[PDB]
Design a binder for this molecule. Structure first.
Ligand code: HEM
Ligand SMILES: COc1cccc(-c2ccc(C(=O)O)cc2)c1
Ligand SMILES: [Cl-]
Length: 393
């Protein structure tokens, strides 16, 4: 019944150009079996959306990587939010939702916008820059560690730690093995900063610890929830912003539409999240036998969801392979969907909006002017180097 495919979605050849294989995965059927890793796969929009919104059968507490926590030891203590199901998920989720709330965005907006404006003006004085190191990495590094309340010492471990986190959701390939091996110094840095004395009052970390007073989380839960923000809160935005700049560099007509109406910045960023899908894949584990796409999946099976594929499925999207900054993007799964839908989405969108606003108001053209290099990661899609020349407006 179910088609068996040999495609390795975690191979460098797949990362280098995933789109033909993603069509093969969609068109093979609503559910496939990936023989390379002994997992089920769903790559169409409808089934990806259905699985994400069925948490009692497609659970997260057995891990959202390939590893099944019922079978193998997690490489670090489980996340209290990402790797938890309701009801254990609910109060930790509520704390992060409140720490990263609409009201909280008012406190950081002016600084985040000012830093984006200043960065674009700085890059315009240089002309020829790397949109990854000098923009997609530099801007989040300039605002997010500070908004967390992190000390200065040790921040060089943040991106390596996140690279490890996202590689570790993958299969035990070379990317994962290399990431986990000798990772203790990155772990030790992050785990130390999660302790309350190391977090500046008023920042996201200290605010998490302040919620221990309410009964929503205990004091021993707070460091792990700070850890969640230090795991997911930086490298995602690096690849999201890099994706947006790469889109604007490749689609000059859309950069010009954004210039003409900078209030399209928020949706231009959202469209970049759909179009590139910085988070490409993750897993669920079945808690029971379940029919999906006409396949009977047994209990305790891993199911791989192709978020980027769902976001390009022509069954759902018109002209899926076009970047369109006025597209109605609502419903894309680049931030997930359902009970685990990105709790940091307001921070991600704030960063993306204010950077694209600064570009819209200050830049007339973005021209690739050196070799583009891809950055390989088992979960994240993005570039290692994006040399561009910025022409001022
Ligand atoms: C463009 C940037 C980002 C993208 C594309 C993204 C994507 C995602 C996705 C797809 C999920 C769902 C995972 C699942 O269902 O298993 C998720 C969850 C999560 N994200 Fe985001 N993320 C981004 C930025 C951020 C930021 C800035 C933060 C924190 C400041 C953050 C923190 C989290 C956390 C803690 C979760 C777990 C939520 C839960 O399990 O309830 N992410 N993200
Ligand atoms: C499994 O695919 C994703 C996609 C986006 C964010 C994350 C993520 C990683 C770690 C945490 C955490 O440590 O809680 C939370 C979210 C995972
Ligand atoms: Cl850790």
């Amino acid at each position: 019944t179910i088609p068996h495919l040999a495609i390795d979605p975690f191979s460098l050849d797949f990362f280098d150009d995933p789109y033909p294989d993603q069509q093969t995965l969609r068109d093979a059927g609503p559910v496939v079996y990936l023989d390379k890793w002994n997992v089920y796969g769903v790559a169409r929009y409808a089934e990806v959306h259905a699985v994400l919104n069925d948490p009692t059968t497609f659970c997260s507490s057995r891990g959202v990587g390939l590893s099944d926590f019922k079978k193998e030891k997690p490489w670090r203590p489980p996340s209290l939010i990402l790797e938890a199901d309701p009801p254990a998920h609910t109060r930790p989720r509520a704390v992060l939702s409140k720490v990263l709330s609409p009201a909280t965005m008012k406190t950081i907006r002016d600084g985040f916008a000012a830093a984006a404006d200043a960065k674009v003006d700085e890059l315009l004085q240089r002309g020829c820059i790397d949109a990854i190191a000098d923009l997609a990495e530099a801007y989040p590094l300039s605002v997010f560690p500070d908004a967390m309340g992190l000390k200065q010492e040790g921040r060089e471990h943040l991106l390596p730690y996140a690279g490890l986190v996202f590689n570790a959701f993958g299969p035990p390939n070379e990317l994962r093995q290399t990431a986990i091996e000798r990772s203790a110094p990155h772990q030790a840095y992050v785990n130390e900063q999660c302790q309350r004395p190391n977090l500046a009052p008023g920042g996201f970390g200290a605010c998490i610890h302040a919620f221990t007073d309410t009964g929503e989380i205990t004091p021993d839960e707070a460091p792990l929830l700070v850890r969640s923000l230090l795991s997911a809160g930086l490298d995602t935005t690096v690849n999201g912003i890099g994706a947006a700049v790469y889109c604007l560099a490749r689609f000059p007509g859309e950069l010009q539409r954004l210039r003409s109406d900078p209030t399209l910045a928020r949706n231009a960023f959202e469209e970049a999240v759909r179009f590139e899908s910085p988070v490409q894949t993750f897993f669920r584990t079945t808690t029971r036998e379940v029919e999906l796409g006409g396949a009977v999946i047994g209990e305790g099976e891993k199911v791989l969801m192709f978020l980027g594929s769902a976001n390009r499925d022509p069954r759902r999207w018109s002209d899926p392979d076009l970047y369109d900054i006025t597209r109605k993007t609502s419903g894309h799964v680049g931030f997930g969907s359902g009970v685990h839908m990105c709790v940091g989405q307001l921070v991600a969108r704030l960063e993306g909006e204010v950077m694209l606003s600064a570009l819209a108001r200050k830049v007339a053209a973005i021209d690739i002017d050196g070799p583009v290099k891809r950055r390989f990661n088992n979960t994240l899609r993005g570039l290692e180097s994006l040399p561009v020349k910025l022409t001022p407006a």
